[PDB]
Design a binder for this molecule. Sequence first.
Ligand SMILES: CN1C[C@H](O)C[C@@H]1C(=O)O
Ligand SMILES: CN1C[C@H](O)C[C@@H]1C(=O)O
Lengths: 113, 791, 791
Amino acid sequence: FMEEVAPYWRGKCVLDRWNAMMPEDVRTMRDGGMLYVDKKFVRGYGENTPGWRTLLAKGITGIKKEAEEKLAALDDAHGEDVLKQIIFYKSLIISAEGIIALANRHADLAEKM
Amino acid sequence: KDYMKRIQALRENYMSRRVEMDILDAYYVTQGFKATEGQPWQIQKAVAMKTVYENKPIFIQDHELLVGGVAFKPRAGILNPDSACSVIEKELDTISTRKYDPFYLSEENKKLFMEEVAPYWRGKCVLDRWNAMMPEDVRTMRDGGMLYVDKKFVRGYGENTPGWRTLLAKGITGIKKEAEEKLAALDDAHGEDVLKQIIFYKSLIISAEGIIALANRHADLAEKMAEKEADEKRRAELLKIAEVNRNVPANPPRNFYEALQSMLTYEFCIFMEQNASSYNLGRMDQYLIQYYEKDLADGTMTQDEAQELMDCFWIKISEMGLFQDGESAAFSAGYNMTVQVCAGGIDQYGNDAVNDLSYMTIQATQDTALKEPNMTVRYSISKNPDSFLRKAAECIRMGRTMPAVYHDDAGIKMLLNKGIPMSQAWDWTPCGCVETNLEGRLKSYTDIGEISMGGVVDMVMNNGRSRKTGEQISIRTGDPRDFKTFDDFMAAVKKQIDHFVHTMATMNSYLDYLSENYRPVPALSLTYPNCMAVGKDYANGGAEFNVGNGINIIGQADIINSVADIKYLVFDEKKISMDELCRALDADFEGYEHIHKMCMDAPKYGNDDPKADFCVGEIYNYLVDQIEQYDSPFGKLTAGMLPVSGNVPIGQSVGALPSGRKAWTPLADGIGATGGTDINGATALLKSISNLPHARFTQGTQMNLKIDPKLLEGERGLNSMMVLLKTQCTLDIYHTQYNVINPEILMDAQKNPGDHKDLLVRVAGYTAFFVELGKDIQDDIIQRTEIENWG
Amino acid sequence: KDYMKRIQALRENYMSRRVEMDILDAYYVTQGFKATEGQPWQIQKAVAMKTVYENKPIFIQDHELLVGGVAFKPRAGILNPDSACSVIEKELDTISTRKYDPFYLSEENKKLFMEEVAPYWRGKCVLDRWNAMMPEDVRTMRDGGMLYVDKKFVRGYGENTPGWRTLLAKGITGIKKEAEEKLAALDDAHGEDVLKQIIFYKSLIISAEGIIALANRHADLAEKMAEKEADEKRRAELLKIAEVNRNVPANPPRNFYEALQSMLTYEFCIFMEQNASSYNLGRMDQYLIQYYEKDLADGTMTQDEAQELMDCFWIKISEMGLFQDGESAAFSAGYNMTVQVCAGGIDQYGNDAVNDLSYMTIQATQDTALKEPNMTVRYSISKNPDSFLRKAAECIRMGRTMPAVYHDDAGIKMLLNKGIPMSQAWDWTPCGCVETNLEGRLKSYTDIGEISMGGVVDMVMNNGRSRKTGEQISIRTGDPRDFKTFDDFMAAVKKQIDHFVHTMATMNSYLDYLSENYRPVPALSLTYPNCMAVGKDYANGGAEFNVGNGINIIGQADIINSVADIKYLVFDEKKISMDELCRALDADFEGYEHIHKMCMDAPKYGNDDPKADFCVGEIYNYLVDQIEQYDSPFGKLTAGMLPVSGNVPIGQSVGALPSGRKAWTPLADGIGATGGTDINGATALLKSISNLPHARFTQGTQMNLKIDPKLLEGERGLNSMMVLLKTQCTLDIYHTQYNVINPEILMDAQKNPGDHKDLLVRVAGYTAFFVELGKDIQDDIIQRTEIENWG
Ligand SMILES: CN1C[C@H](O)C[C@@H]1C(=O)O
Ligand SMILES: CN1C[C@H](O)C[C@@H]1C(=O)O
């Protein structure tokens, strides 16, 4: 952690930004124990039910294909806002290839065993 | 004139100045960012500039009345590592002797850079983001030299006229007071959008604190210097510098002296925030008339003392120098931060705006005779006096290479075409090279990058393949021998334009993305009042008017002559087959010299020849048609024809052309004739360029003319210069500029540069020291038609 | 030219036509409405126009090659009962002999109108609504004559150029086919907003069916006439007339003959839809050139035949005569439907648009020498050939009073300032008098009412009280004896202007409200592509570009001279006390002959005198600034200076002025100088008017000149005319018009009307028959300066 992780994220992670940006009335009330304010800065969203029906009806490959197609319809010549969508779809595609990889490593492990 | 003694001294000190790379600025920005890790980039960036203002070295040179700097020395290039940090890291060891616009980078500053700056900014500066994100069509097109797409990723916004009237009216303190007011009114409990406004206002306030500090630091310095100063005349002017700098730009100027220093300090500050061209002073003759007139009336100042002050202002302005990477430097050569000040035009009643300041703005250029500021005249033929056009003609005749003369109404039309109402468009300011701006109110990149119209003809002729490398650089619009009619050839041209424009628009999305996220300019946003109203940086559309960024177009004469000459030679005369033409074109004309002479003799744009000019309106309205279909958060993209020096580098990518152009030579400068192909006089050349739809190109149009000096001798020569200039307005030509130089002086400058260090030449919308240009740019200039007849 | 035999005959037919009042149109419109009770206004209007189109009597006159009309006979004014029913009722027994534009109302048409028409429309037509609703601030300014407000409530939209290109390329069936397809693709289950769309498309379909019904009736009538025609030549024309009216406007014209009939049939149907001025043909020369050139290639038509058709067309167009109430008539005299058609300008590539038809456009006017069309020249000095300019000048010299010459770039600037992109503004068309339009794409009332600038000045001098009645009719700006300086005087003029403009803005709110509800124009919407794309009528923002309505401004030289002369007399020269001045103004200079001689001798607008012209830009930028602060559903209001003939009526409410103008005489026409005060030549006159900010008046400016015929003799006189017109462009002057007429003729035309029934005069943006103008308007024209010096 200390050698390969900690230095990269100092001032970068969400909790560091929170501590850097915390307004003072917020600080006072948190220091006074009147509010508690930190835990969603520490840990991501959670607190949702994802689209299980979507996962099941389409699988990650179906979703990734919708994203490949939405991405292919889009044109980054059409301005920054399209660019932001292209980035999002790219990110769905990347992240979806990763999920599938992890499922397959397990499959690989089970076959080796 | 007495004050000229001082001006000559300041000039001599400017000339003896080596161009050096500044790094302290970059170092202090880095400290600022590190000092605020985890804060919003707008806070980080404002604190960094406050760190720069509070800490940079400052100086007050001998004889200076106006004081300041962007760096630790005059003419020093600053590095904004939030933008172009990898540039200095890639040419750490070559920048001192690189082909174009070298900067002496001390061994000291290399170590500061490599140790204290470069590490923090890897993968973080705008340039590194772009290199990371560049889509492949852009990289393919760029690598094949059909586009230049890197300029604005390297160097900040620039390309705008700050709100000089707000800074003069309120001072930096009044503005910060307003931001403080806005900030107190806002509540961070009212959601993320309000927090964004809070951040921006906080970032405005830090910036404002920084700027006032830097002005106070100079006052402190002048104070201490004056105690130390034996000469009672200098001591007096030093204590005056102390009082002036204490007042502005914190407070509204009290007099002409202070108004000048106010602009100068702010000009330096916004420049330090982002190295970039075109931080236009704009209409100083309008902004400062109130203080000049008050002082003359009061006795507190004389007209000659005002000229003296303006002359020093000119010299201080000239002590900035655009920094950029070595490639971009061939496209933007001579350290042309290109700070356009202008004179003339109309007032808010549409009346003639020419006043004493107008004349003295010209007189500051004649006196000081440096490459900057880029001093030009909004010339209203319907309203401005002959005497004012005359003084401009005399300035030109002196070889000052300025002013550039704008047809005022063309400039107004361009602002209307930008969506600005006429109630404000009378007040337009020419920008940087030849673009159009509006004091404190219009936001745009006026030049994101360059399309090579020459490339467009090469892609048609070589079916999308680089003649240099052979790779498929563009789309395949077909084998040119399959073109049955000239219409099929023209279809090919048009498809290629779609691709070049589409690719530039692709690039524009990344640029607007990276800019909005990583190029907040709060110091600049201080002087855009609408930014205060809506709580958004200049970068995020806070300005009153936003338009789409400008696509720049290089090679008018090359595209126009190749189209005309292909129609003429292949399709109407049938002097040669398409096949033979292509072979001639592949051979670079070696072994086909009768074909070359046939190409050279075919109609040439610039002669009022209809066989050459019939196509100009179609190609360039088509081109602008493509550009404008692309939308951004800031509006539909705009277009300009301000090649800068980029015609020289961008031509190295373009093979031989049907116009007779041999491979890898320069494309034509500006919108004018290829060198030596216009031989019908000035007037005929203007007629040819009037075929361009200037008003379609809202980022401006840049024309060169090189006049034989004998044509300007005597009052007869002057009248003829004015007739030509009036002719330009009549023909609706946006812009013209004049080199007037004995051509042996330019050739001697190549061989004995040491004896021509202040030799000025007009390159493309801006002036440069001739010996300071890469030889190819020098040769481009040399070979321009010396125009021997007025017409 | 042989074909001139048919044009002479057609022209003799037109010149002997008595001007009558049609009622059948109003009767059938009342029927259509009765037959549609419970239906939306838009369906009613549409069905009422089917009924008008399918039932009104039609005619085919001897020698006519093109056919149609808007009423039971040529030159009849029609009654759109839906807009102005109550005017025919109030003037039922006076209209046949009223002072301005009499319309002989047959006793029989009186009876049909009163029994079947008037009852239905009381409290129903827009004029009735406006009177019900007219707020009291409008009433008491209208009363007392400060504003004229009633025009556009009486007379439908007009002032626009329909989508000629859409009609010509698609035909009314093509468009109906689109409306039908949009209709089929909408589901009225999707809510009130869609039903509105559906309602609108239906109204288009119904309109479109009626216009093809009308054309076919003409083809039918022609074939029946053919059956009874002995001469085979005439019989063969009638058969051709039948063939073309079966095709157009239903289908795209197969030839130039068919294209002319197409526009004309359509032009008559949109005039029938609403009596209104300035349904402009626009750029005929560009819309029809490919028909003319294809037809000439095919041997199916000669340039001579093309000229003859156009001459026919010119006469046909002349056969409309604008209708309005007795009082509106004083403001717009001469039956001035102002159907403008311009040649020249630049094409879509920015190139010279002049072609054969551009010359034949001028030629037709010269051939037909009638009051309409309002033939005008878009003149681009940088692009249009001199040959074109000289033809225009040759036509002006003949006494045709046309064309009006527009500086093309100024026309473009106004469209840009309306927010039209330069990609479409090259395509502007002068409108009605001198307003700006864009073919099938721009919606606005270009002239809703008139501000009396005279009245403004009278209101300062008399502290907002009428000189006629003594009533308080405007706001209070202070006793003028209390204005210590010219600045307080100017401040009061501004305050008056604020209130006038405010009250015009108030009336505009009512006009839009009534317009949008009770003035759908389905016929007109057929040729606005965007109404089809959004499914809203022209009247509901369907057009591609909407600007707010245009406030008209009358009395330029009057407020300028009064402002200038107050300043010279009371404040600079102090040779007359403000009280002395007011006492003399209250007296109408009666017994103050010395003061009146001093005011006559104070500087006069129109002489290029800075003592007079110093205030022009400031007052008129203030004015447009005021107008422009007001928004509507269609954009900010717009402004124009096209007084029409309203300077004569509006002047009857203005007492004497410090400019020396006696009480209740006409104000100055257009934007030029007061008769008999411009003594410095035409060029100085043009220089004075160049101080107006023509750009800011997006609804145009109208300039009259009257040139001593002797000034135009021979090739030199034409030369001087052309130089004058180039000076016009140099000075950025939007518009000029030329009366060229021996003065005796005018005066004989007052003694012997019957010896001069075709004597044309240029009035103010348009041409009238001099003998059809009320004497006091004739006198105004007569006292115009006969410029005897070009300058
Ligand atoms: C020197 N600059 C002037 C214009 O702003 C464009 C040019 C650049 O950015 O290279
Ligand atoms: C003569 N018309 C031209 C203008 O558009 C309006 C005017 C009218 O009739 O009111």
